[PDB]
Design a protein around this ligand. Structure first.
Ligand SMILES: *[C@@H]1O[C@H](CO)[C@@H](O[C@@H]2O[C@H](CO)[C@@H](O)[C@H](O)[C@H]2NC(C)=O)[C@H](O)[C@H]1NC(C)=O
Ligand SMILES: *[C@@H]1O[C@H](CO)[C@@H](O[C@@H]2O[C@H](CO)[C@@H](O)[C@H](O)[C@H]2NC(C)=O)[C@H](O)[C@H]1NC(C)=O
Ligand SMILES: *[C@@H]1O[C@H](CO)[C@@H](O[C@@H]2O[C@H](CO)[C@@H](O)[C@H](O)[C@H]2NC(C)=O)[C@H](O)[C@H]1NC(C)=O
Ligand SMILES: *[C@@H]1O[C@H](CO)[C@@H](O[C@@H]2O[C@H](CO)[C@@H](O)[C@H](O)[C@H]2NC(C)=O)[C@H](O)[C@H]1NC(C)=O
Ligand SMILES: *[C@@H]1O[C@H](CO)[C@@H](O[C@@H]2O[C@H](CO)[C@@H](O)[C@H](O)[C@H]2NC(C)=O)[C@H](O)[C@H]1NC(C)=O
Ligand SMILES: *[C@@H]1O[C@H](CO)[C@@H](O[C@@H]2O[C@H](CO)[C@@H](O)[C@H](O)[C@H]2NC(C)=O)[C@H](O)[C@H]1NC(C)=O
Ligand SMILES: *[C@@H]1O[C@H](CO)[C@@H](O[C@@H]2O[C@H](CO)[C@@H](O)[C@H](O)[C@H]2NC(C)=O)[C@H](O)[C@H]1NC(C)=O
Ligand SMILES: *[C@@H]1O[C@H](CO)[C@@H](O[C@@H]2O[C@H](CO)[C@@H](O)[C@H](O)[C@H]2NC(C)=O)[C@H](O)[C@H]1NC(C)=O
Ligand SMILES: *[C@@H]1O[C@H](CO)[C@@H](O[C@@H]2O[C@H](CO)[C@@H](O)[C@H](O)[C@H]2NC(C)=O)[C@H](O)[C@H]1NC(C)=O
Ligand SMILES: *[C@H](N)[C@@H]1C[C@@H]2C[C@@H]2N1C(=O)[C@@H](N)[C@@]12C[C@@H]3C[C@@](O)(C[C@@](O)(C3)C1)C2
Ligand SMILES: *[C@H](N)[C@@H]1C[C@@H]2C[C@@H]2N1C(=O)[C@@H](N)[C@@]12C[C@@H]3C[C@@](O)(C[C@@](O)(C3)C1)C2
Ligand SMILES: *[C@@H]1O[C@H](CO)[C@@H](O)[C@H](O)[C@H]1NC(C)=O
Ligand SMILES: *[C@@H]1O[C@H](CO)[C@@H](O)[C@H](O)[C@H]1NC(C)=O
Ligand SMILES: *[C@@H]1O[C@H](CO)[C@@H](O)[C@H](O)[C@H]1NC(C)=O
Lengths: 728, 728
């Protein structure tokens, strides 16, 4: 008999997806790690040599976390003693190894506890951040030049982000931007002097007698934000002057009038940089285009080259204003912007004309611009078959916009409906990554005629293993509400029979611009629930969801905790109408925004749901950070949106939890959604005499992702769902 | 058929015990609050007058928390704006009402946020502590004299205790001691400069955007302790123009050689004070007897008058060295000390003689000396019927030790086996307070011929109510281990039938010198479990337990988490073989030390217990405070007892929790047993893959005693026990 996909299968990673992670080092070659050996592959023919033997660093004395090779191929940066900070940030030690002379460098080493390091884009200059200040090495073995002196722990950040810029603005820790040939180093400086601190206990190993208090500058909604400045230094002057001058580029007057953010930095040429700025009220953004002036040594941004983007129905961009892609000469650029119908499409700008030309259109959206050549622009969209949850690679002829070719749509239509892409240095080659609905498939292509050169990884090994398992199926479809299609997916038990009635778990996220119905193949907890426990696991993308235009996405503007919550309840009613759901056994669960929505649904008094699980939920918008929260909610003041901030809390719905079984879970060291949020939910439930189940996870963060904690939480949740559904 | 005692009855206080709380104001009269009116009673005849009408302060404008009348009856201190701190400490505002004028005092008022206030023992002087400094008022409407100028929040404490002296040494916030006629004010000063802080989050009301971090100087085991100094000031020679001179009494040389504590302060005469000092290794203590020298102005403690008290088998005293009771002339004293066999009895000392004479003896213990006259010493003991869990009042004739009279034993032997007492100022009269096994009974007596004057409160109203309820019964008996009897009690369901098999819950505390098997009448959770759920609730006093001599009490010296744990298991094993216990349904629960023992038992692998609940448990002795932990454990150093500190943790037993159902509960704002302790238990269980149930209580402290939290925790625990025992 074929076994099912069990909880242990999921928790012990018995059935692993194979990857093919490569790193392009040129237009024709990439690096790849095969059994600890770093190999160089030739793209055209597929042959390889050993770049770095696995035995090279056997006597190093430290486990190597990662490597980074200089762009000129002369040096390799070895990263070790990795200590994670937030989602992207960490500290590490670094050694540099000379490849041409086969030697480690012991002279003038990068310090321990270095926060960030990057090679220049050409050659082998290094910039790094240490104790919140920027340093530059022209040569790996020579003394560093200090660039900034103002760095101060938790206060002034030079060339790295503070908590909120890392998580909500840049999705990155770095704040250093080398010019294309490495002459200039641009950087941001953040000042968190008056930003309040979130404080929480960290217990550590049992040996630690007194708990540590972690203290992090973190602006909650409406609080004092960090301020920002932007600078550019000429690194070629460093060896000639004792102290090189950092030249400030100031934000536009339209930004300086109040609170604002720096939201994009993009080099256009050797001597031209674009900066995007965003008002704290995030429906107005300004792009400056700034040129170096040789005679004055200053950077000037002509107003004739300033571009404004605003939104009358919501915020700017999906999560921020989109990034520009400059043509080689730097005199024009392409950018995804919302069109007059509210659909995100590629627009083409000359740097000194304010009106752009849309080069794509239709009732679907461009997801990202991936590459730009003299002849073609390459982009990912969900055009194909009008499925907003699919992703394909297209190219558009720059001399004739009517000529658009899909490069991935027909490669394997049944197996592959969701693609991402990685182009070589000048887009001569590309790797396609298919992630579903079948098993992941990695292929390599040449851009001249888009020929498929070879299959890199086809997951044949996993395919063989899964033959002996009763795997669930997946249905992706839509329901029509008020003349609008809303997409859903169901993970269906093996041998699914529509004449029978199944328990159902609604797996919710539902944050603005999110998508939970797609064509991606996943091996996760839902796979187990469907395969082993015969539970249907459903998800629904309602109002506020992404990739379907602004009419849908902006529906929850200034009104979080309303329509997107109502639409999950309605989805459950619609699934019941399909005839194969046991209406006595409907449950709901989610994590973060999904935890908030789960809790709001459970507190609604709808009577639809028997039970639910909230993991690390938001409970009150005033407890979450300014950049994310205010994007959708504006400010929590009587003059703006305080009334809605106050009636969209989980705590106000406490009395209605009397009608449901609730399990509330939170990691105690969650720096993102603070434990505070669940502590206030539990207190409110206690105050009204509602019984519920709880679990804290000591020292876990938002991911609850340590190997043991991951296994424990899914085990605890599994018992709860099974009890709720009367399943042995 | 009649109702049972329900969970709601317990939680809503449906059946209330009546009290009779009086305060003696002389040898002949006492005060008593009846219907908010304060009445004065004549002891001899029982007639009364209204002292203060309940309407006097109708226009006061504040809710009055408490009152304190001056010893001369001329003033009343009114306490309001009460804000709780720790177990005993709080701050408050104070007004003073002048009874001669019938007016509130409007000048030179006691400051807001006052930490402690006390009248002199005679007359109407006041001493108070505000912002950690001591002040004295000679008359209530006159300006205060500032005694100390060194007070500093969290650092220097004058006349009040720090966290650990409050909880573990004096069981009080005050560290001020007036001489008998009010001439001198003695005080301690605590210095916490190098004591590390426990830090934990406090979430407050939902309106608070950022959690607050609470920081308390708290020495965990082996950490830097507070240091102490002792001073005496003459309040009769205070000046408006000169700062007050405090005279220091330094600790003896035998104490100064290392870390030590001040553990007792007792005035002997108007010009003689006794102090007891205790080494940090608490098996050695010294009493100094210090006389005022009217010509030098010093306090001199003659070496010839020092008294050493040491223990070879354990620590000194039950929880600290006992208080002396000085004779009229202050030249001799009576004190409870452990005799040669290890039983605590009254010893009679001359102040300048090394050897004392035991005036009581036997294999039972004196609980406390309650009053001393020239003729008689009055004491409470468990002599009667050799029952260590009973308490009676005795007097011994000081001129003839063969003449011992039990004053309470025969008053009402079926109803009353556990007494406490309150004597009038010079012991002309005493109130007896019986607390079981029947309903509490309060009576008044005269000392001259031990006449029973009147019944003050007999709880006949509650008796009438309980006749309509199926109440449980209580069995008190013993089992014999190694020729030693160990006492247990069982709360037995109504209509108990020994041919039937009942589930059993073992209610455990089992801390050193504790007693859980006694003759006290209680209305509590156990009452409900037995009455309504038909569960037997048993408790057992094994090794380490109190009031039965040092052989038993000192058995766990340097070895907490050994014999007292093993003895609970052995007890339950014996119970499980009794023909009326279902061996498949035995549970265990406890709070604090009881949570520790519950957890240690559940991690023992004994297999005896199906499930258990630990509330606010200790998990590792290095996490608890120095004064308590080291008394039993010594220091956590390789040279002392580190190995046993490391072997006695809950965390080390995590693997054994695989075969039990465990529920772990802790208040997040517990300043006593820190949330840290349970956070470490949960992390250990997660690390070995053990599933368990958890509940945190936001902003609750060690008591989990807010109205709503109290109701919630017992509701949660009730569901858990009922599910464990398969009860509907
Ligand atoms: C990073 O830290 C390591 C380990 O502390 C440093 O290596 C040595 O550490 C030992 C003590 O363990 C000391 O004797 C020296 O300070 C170090 N000696 C040498 C030869 O390195 C190391 O120095 C640190 N790295 C940098 C770049 O400062
Ligand atoms: C970062 O911002 C702070 C202001 O929030 C600046 O620090 C000072 O702030 C104090 C009080 O907030 C003022 O008295 C000063 O005028 C500010 N300036 C200085 C020089 O102390 C601070 O200067 C900023 N730091 C940097 C590096 O820009
Ligand atoms: C990197 O780019 C910079 C900026 O364009 C180049 O430096 C300039 O070169 C031009 C012409 O070669 C000179 O007129 C200027 O004096 C230079 N300006 C500055 C600020 O340096 C530089 O040539 C490039 N570097 C390399 C290695 O090609
Ligand atoms: C950006 O959003 C703000 C806040 O909604 C808009 O502010 C206007 O001013 C106040 C509220 O701040 C109201 O009296 C107006 O009705 C708001 N206008 C609206 C809601 O349309 C501001 O108009 C927005 N900017 C853009 C370009 O749409
Ligand atoms: C209890 O009763 C006695 C009277 O028997 C009270 O003593 C009397 O007090 C009143 C006024 O205070 C005087 O007029 C009498 O002269 C007193 N008589 C005696 C014999 O002393 C006593 O005050 C009462 N006590 C209380 C508390 O009400
Ligand atoms: C205790 O605090 C109260 C309130 O702050 C003080 O109240 C006084 O009366 C009003 C408000 O009730 C204030 O405007 C005055 O400043 C206060 N002063 C006086 C002289 O009454 C009160 O005084 C404080 N008590 C003490 C003893 O400091
Ligand atoms: C309270 O205790 C501290 C010691 O913990 C005393 O302060 C000094 O402590 C430092 C080390 O922390 C030593 O260098 C000094 O010798 C100590 N005292 C002096 C006077 O130098 C502090 O003085 C004490 N305060 C009081 C009021 O007793
Ligand atoms: C309270 O006790 C004190 C201390 O014994 C008494 O004051 C002493 O007694 C006499 C007063 O006549 C003097 O010789 C001493 O100088 C006093 N000592 C001090 C330290 O002041 C006082 O008399 C007692 N009070 C009463 C009312 O008897
Ligand atoms: C009080 O207890 C301490 C420690 O338990 C005893 O100290 C002795 O001396 C040193 C210092 O710790 C140790 O090496 C010895 O082993 C201790 N002797 C023992 C445990 O017998 C001290 O003896 C005890 N005091 C009394 C009166 O028994
Ligand atoms: C939960 N995911 C958390 C609470 C609310 C929704 C916001 N949360 C975040 O962590 C945000 N920092 C991000 C920001 C973007 C968009 C997200 O939907 C997903 C994310 O990875 C990137 C994290 C919410
Ligand atoms: C729990 N009860 C806690 C942990 C360990 C046993 C000690 N605990 C205390 O709170 C102590 N501070 C006290 C000290 C004495 C004796 C006790 O048994 C009871 C108490 O009220 C007085 C508190 C333990
Ligand atoms: C691949 O093969 C070509 C010859 O066919 C050779 O020139 C090249 O060096 C090889 N590349 C690698 C990375 O082995
Ligand atoms: C370098 O110059 C900057 C800007 O004037 C100044 O703040 C800093 O102190 C200087 N550093 C040194 C070492 O002179
Ligand atoms: C009393 O002592 C304090 C603190 O040293 C000082 O500020 C004050 O002036 C002193 N008063 C007199 C009268 O000396």
């Amino acid at each position: 008999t074929r076994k099912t996909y069990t909880l242990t299968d999921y928790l012990k990673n018995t059935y692993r997806l194979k990857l093919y992670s490569l790193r392009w080092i040129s237009d024709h070659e990439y690096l790849y790690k095969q059994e600890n050996n770093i190999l160089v592959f030739n793209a055209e023919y597929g042959n390889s040599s050993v770049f770095l033997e696995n035995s090279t660093f056997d006597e190093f004395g430290h486990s190597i976390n990662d490597y980074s090779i200089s762009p000129d191929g002369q040096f390799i940066l070895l990263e070790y003693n990795y200590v994670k900070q937030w989602r992207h940030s960490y500290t590490a030690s670094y050694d540099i190894y000379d490849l041409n002379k086969r030697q480690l460098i012991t002279e003038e080493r990068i310090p321990n506890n270095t926060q960030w390091v990057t090679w220049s884009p050409v050659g082998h200059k290094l910039a790094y951040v240490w104790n919140n200040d920027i340093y530059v090495k022209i040569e790996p073995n020579l003394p560093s030049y200090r660039i900034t002196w103002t760095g101060k722990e938790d206060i002034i950040y030079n060339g790295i982000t503070d908590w909120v810029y890392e998580e909500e603005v840049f999705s990155a820790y770095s704040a250093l931007w080398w010019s294309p040939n490495g002459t200039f180093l641009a950087y941001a400086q953040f000042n968190d002097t008056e930003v309040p601190l979130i404080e929480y206990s960290f217990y550590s190993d049992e040996s630690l007698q007194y708990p540590k208090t972690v203290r992090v500058p973190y602006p909650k909604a409406g609080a004092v934000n960090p301020t920002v400045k932007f600078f550019v230094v000429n690194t070629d002057s460093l060896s000639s002057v004792t102290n090189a001058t950092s030249i400030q580029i100031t934000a536009p007057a339209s930004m300086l009038i109040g609170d604002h953010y720096l939201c994009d930095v993009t080099w256009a040429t050797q001597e031209r940089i674009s900066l995007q700025w965003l008002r704290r009220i995030q429906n107005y953004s300004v792009m400056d285009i700034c040129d170096y002036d040789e005679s004055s040594g200053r950077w000037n941004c002509l107003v004739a080259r300033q571009h404004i983007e605003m939104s009358t129905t919501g915020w700017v961009g999906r999560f921020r204003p989109s990034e520009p892609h400059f043509t080689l000469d730097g005199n024009s650029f392409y950018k995804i912007i919302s069109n007059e119908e509210g659909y995100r499409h590629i627009c083409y700008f000359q740097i000194d004309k304010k009106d752009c030309t849309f080069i794509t259109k239709g009732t679907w959206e461009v997801i990202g611009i991936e590459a730009l050549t003299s002849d073609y622009l390459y982009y990912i969209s969900n055009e194909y078959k009008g499925m907003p949850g699919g992703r394909n690679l297209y190219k558009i002829q720059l001399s004739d916009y009517t000529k658009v070719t899909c490069l991935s749509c027909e490669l394997n239509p049944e197996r592959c409906q969701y693609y991402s892409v990685s182009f070589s240095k000048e887009a001569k080659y590309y790797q396609l990554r298919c992630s579903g609905p079948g098993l992941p498939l990695y292929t390599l292509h040449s851009s001249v005629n888009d020929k498929g050169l070879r299959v890199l990884e086809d997951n044949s090994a996993l395919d063989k293993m899964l033959q002996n398992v009763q795997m669930p199926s997946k249905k992706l479809d839509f329901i029509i509400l008020n003349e609008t299609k809303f997409w859903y997916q169901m993970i269906l038990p093996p041998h699914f029979d529509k004449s029978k009635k199944y328990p159902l778990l609604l797996d919710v996220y539902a944050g603005p611009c999110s998508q939970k119905a797609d064509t991606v193949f996943r091996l996760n907890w839902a796979t187990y629930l469907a395969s082993t426990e015969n539970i249907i696991v459903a998800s629904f993308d309602g109002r506020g969801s992404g990739y379907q235009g602004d009419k849908i996405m902006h529906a929850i503007n200034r009104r979080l905790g309303t329509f997107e919550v109502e639409d999950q309840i309605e989805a459950a009613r619609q699934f019941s109408k399909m005839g194969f759901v046991d209406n006595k056994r409907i449950a709901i669960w989610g994590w973060s925004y999904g935890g908030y929505v789960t809790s709001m649904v459970l507190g609604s008094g709808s009577g639809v749901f028997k039970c639910g699980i909230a993991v690390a939920p938001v409970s009150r918008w005033e407890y979450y950070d300014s950049v994310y929260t205010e994007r959708y909610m504006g400010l929590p003041t009587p003059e703006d949106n305080l009334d809605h901030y106050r009636n969209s809390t989980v705590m106000s719905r406490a009395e209605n939890f009397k009608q449901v079984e609730y399990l509330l879970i939170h990691g105690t060291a969650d720096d993102n959604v603070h434990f505070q949020q669940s502590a206030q939910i539990s207190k409110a439930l206690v105050d009204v005499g509602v019984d519920f189940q709880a679990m804290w996870y000591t020292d876990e963060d938002h991911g609850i992702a340590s190997s043991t904690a991951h296994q424990h939480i899914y085990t605890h949740m599994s018992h709860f769902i099974k009890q709720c559904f009367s399943l042995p």
